[PDB]
């Protein structure tokens, strides 16, 4: 009933987050969903599809608008146990929360991939596994739930540090109080685009509300750069290493294009071209292609791209090498 206080607070904040996009809003979850209009709007926002509506302001209009939402969920094979339209239109607290949870679970939490997963892991289990992989390497017991494991605030800070090590000091997190750790995690996460669904004072308890924590943790996962399934991309564990690869690659090619462009200003001129140039060109290609995978991390703020490291800055010296290549081309041409 205190987790209900908190779950309601979280689910309200979560709902308002999405209604914001269409200029809708709720104050009391147990009242402002009863006519079916905001439930529908929420589903339209979340799903990207347009739903029908019953105009009218009798109770059966209310019941039908709720039913339109329930059917839409049932049709997408969502399981609605015990929830019926009159439960919603009449304000049933426990079933209103269950319905929001069902929506959250289906639209936000369920769309997660984790290399290391099975086909038969729940979303909850997959998300748990992500947190374990991300925070592997920080001091702490293993995370096996979405309640007590999160109450001291250290997990939150580790999640963030993995993605933005410059924004968190994990040493200090070891000896700060739970409240300080929680407060500063929510704060920083906000800067990185994570809406504050939780209040530090509600999580600093022995058993924080699981559905609230999952919703927030899942939301952090949404905000962070991700590698799509099987696709090409860079995880938070590979970034430092790829970023160094990249810079080193440039620090190798650029000055070869510069020291091998001066030779062109002053019969083997066919080997200095169908051999090396086809290789050095390929470097330029390997480079510009790697930069593409890095863009995400540059936009995310993890990498500050120093000047003279864009794939362009390479093309502008490769162009210069193409010119002086053409000068001494028409000359060794008789």
Residue numbers in the entry: 41 to 306, 321 to 388
What did the paper state?
Evolutionarily conserved in multicellular organisms, spectraplakin proteins such as ACF7 (Actin-Crosslinking Factor 7) can crosslink microtubules and F-actin56. ACF7 harbours an actin-binding domain (ABD) at its N terminus and a microtubule-binding domain at its C terminus. The ABD of ACF7 contains two consecutive CH (calponin homology) domains. ACF7 is a microtubule and F-actin crosslinker that is critically involved in regulation of cell/ECM adhesion dynamics.
To illuminate the potential mechanisms of how F-actin binding of ACF7-CH domains is regulated, we resolved crystal structure of ACF7-NT (containing the CH domains and a part of the plakin domain) at 2.6 Å resolution. ACF7-NT is folded into an elongated polypeptide that is ∼92.4-Å long and ∼58/14.3-Å wide with two tandem CH domains following the spectrin repeat 1 (SR1) of the plakin domain. The SR1 of ACF7’s plakin domain consists of three α-helices connected by short loops that pack in a left-handed helical bundle with a typical up–down–up topology, which is highly conserved among plakin family protein. ACF7’s ABD consists of only α-helices connected by short-loop sequences, and adopts a closed conformation with extensive intramolecular contacts between the two tandem CH domains. Previous biochemical and mutagenesis studies have revealed three major F-ABSs (ABS1–3) in the tandem CH domains, which are conserved in ACF7. However, in closed conformation of ACF7’s ABD, a number of key residues in the ABSs were buried within the protein and were unlikely to be involved in association with F-actin. Interestingly, tyrosine 259 is outside of the conserved ABSs and located at the C-terminal end of the last α-helix in the second CH2 domain. This residue is in close proximity with the hinge region of ABD in the closed conformation. Structural analysis demonstrated that tyrosine 259 forms hydrogen bonds with isoleucine 150 and tyrosine 151 in the hinge region of CH domains. In addition, the hinge region between CH1 and CH2 domain is stabilized by the hydrophobic interactions between isoleucine 150, isoleucine 152 and leucine 165, leucine 167 and tryptophan 168.
